[PDB]
Amino acid sequence: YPAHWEADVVLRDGGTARVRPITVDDAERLVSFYEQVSDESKYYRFFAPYPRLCAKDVHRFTHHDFVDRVGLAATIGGEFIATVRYDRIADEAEVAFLVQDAHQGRGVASALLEHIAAVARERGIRRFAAEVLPANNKMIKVFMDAGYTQKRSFEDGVVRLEFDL
């Protein structure tokens, strides 16, 4: 992958985190990270209880062609504190992110959204779409601030947010 996809980003507290592509070598890091995510945040990320990743998921979340699918991690001291990814659906892709609860509000989610957009623009993605549970207002606000707009909402209350790249 391009060298500029790995970069230090500035957090709101003035410190830094490393943003970088997730690689095939990151299975253990991903699993350790996921252990530190709250049940509530897991629910918001997968829309159902998902306490531990199945092996096929650990694989898919660490194996990317980096054209149709991209995953990035934010790290501090080598440890994952958040991930973001897109999946081409077309020149539209679904985006999702997940941050360890203890590191919310540090600017990590905002940086990851900016970075994944920048990568997408290089790989011919024209739009991002995200589905979010309506009560997850912390996540919705992250997307709003990143320039996403509510396109529609569904019977299950799920909101579809879109961002033109």
């Binding site: 997968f46 829309f47 159902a48 199945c54 990814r85 999946d87 679904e94 589905e131 019977e155 299950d156």
Partner: protein, 115 residues
């Protein structure tokens, strides 16, 4: 609520994933319809059924015991892995006249429901 019931179901040693929807039942008031994925190597059986229901009954209470346990390998998900609850509601309710990662899951869910 549904999340409590799903959490209890996933807590079961033999259950891997679960997604629960509430649907109007004309006889019962509301029916609790649970889509459940067993872990690798586990297989459905007439008695696993009663075990799971008894499990929920003990963990949460009789009011939360699923009325239907729909064993499946086929939870409908977006490419990022998010459960498509709206599709599950429609299938459980028979409301089937009309981001999904694998379209093939719908046909499998519809078959399992008629079985």
């Amino acid at each position: 609520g549904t999340a409590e019931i799903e959490s209890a179901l996933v807590a079961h040693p033999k259950i891997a994933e679960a997604a629960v929807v509430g649907i109007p039942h004309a006889i019962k008031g509301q029916a609790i319809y649970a889509y459940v994925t067993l872990n690798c190597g586990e297989e459905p059986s007439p008695e696993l059924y009663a075990e799971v229901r008894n499990w929920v009954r003990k963990e949460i209470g009789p009011l939360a015991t699923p009325d239907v346990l729909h064993w499946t390998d086929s939870l409908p998900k977006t490419r990022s892995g998010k459960i498509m609850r709206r599709i599950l509601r429609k299938i459980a309710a028979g409301d089937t006249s009309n981001t999904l990662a694998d379209p093939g899951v719908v046909e499998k869910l519809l078959e399992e429901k008629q079985a």
